[PDB]
Write a protein that binds this ligand. Structure first.
Ligand SMILES: Cc1c(O)cccc1C(=O)N[C@@H](CSc1ccccc1)[C@H](O)CN1C[C@H]2CCCC[C@H]2C[C@H]1C(=O)NC(C)(C)C
Lengths: 99, 99
């Protein structure tokens, strides 16, 4: 599909077969999800945005479907107010910016 | 153009007759530029991101040419690691997400 930017580009994602609303974010290098108790090993990480750094848990090779398109890769979990789909997964679904 | 996301979507902007690199950021509502002088009145504002809130200066009605496309709108100036072109100006240049 084509998504305009009049509003926040929010789409449904599926992770663990669970559905969430998430922001398609070309300005994020990484995918960052709201606190969730995901199974498996993880590694501590820090990521910086506007305002400073937050601590996140890095989970690798996690399947996640974005607007019906399958993806698998690294997902960071931490205290974000919004689920963020970053470039690592946006490339996997063939997402582009066009003007 | 069509821009893929294997690298950060950085483009050259021209603002106040000066060239800068800025990030095309669909996850940002607002446009936020690194410390710089812009003419005209500004007002103090606060904006929030992943790491928390920052203080910015809000300049309204500011011409910016983004990768050859003209916008005139609100530009926030403050402590950011990267120049960010947000949805307020991405919409003006006809930018969409596509997959
Ligand atoms: C989440 C993330 C990563 O995993 C890796 C790199 C950057 C980011 C990141 O937070 N990037 C942001 C741009 S600000 C930015 C800061 C530093 C470097 C590059 C960009 C997001 O694209 C936009 N970001 C998306 C989103 C992040 C969660 C909080 C709510 C919004 C806040 C919004 C944002 O910050 N908007 C402003 C108007 C304040 C600019």
């Amino acid at each position: 599909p084509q998504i305009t930017l009049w509003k926040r580009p929010l789409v449904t994602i599926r992770i663990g077969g669970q559905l969430k609303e998430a922001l398609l974010d070309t300005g994020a290098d990484d995918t960052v999800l709201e606190e969730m108790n995901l199974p498996g090993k993880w590694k501590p990480k820090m990521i910086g945005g506007i305002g400073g750094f937050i601590k996140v848990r890095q989970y690798d090779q996690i399947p996640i479907e974005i607007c019906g398109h399958k993806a698998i890769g690294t997902v960071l979990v931490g205290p974000t107010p919004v689920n963020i789909i970053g470039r690592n997964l946006l490339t996997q679904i063939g997402c582009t910016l066009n003007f």
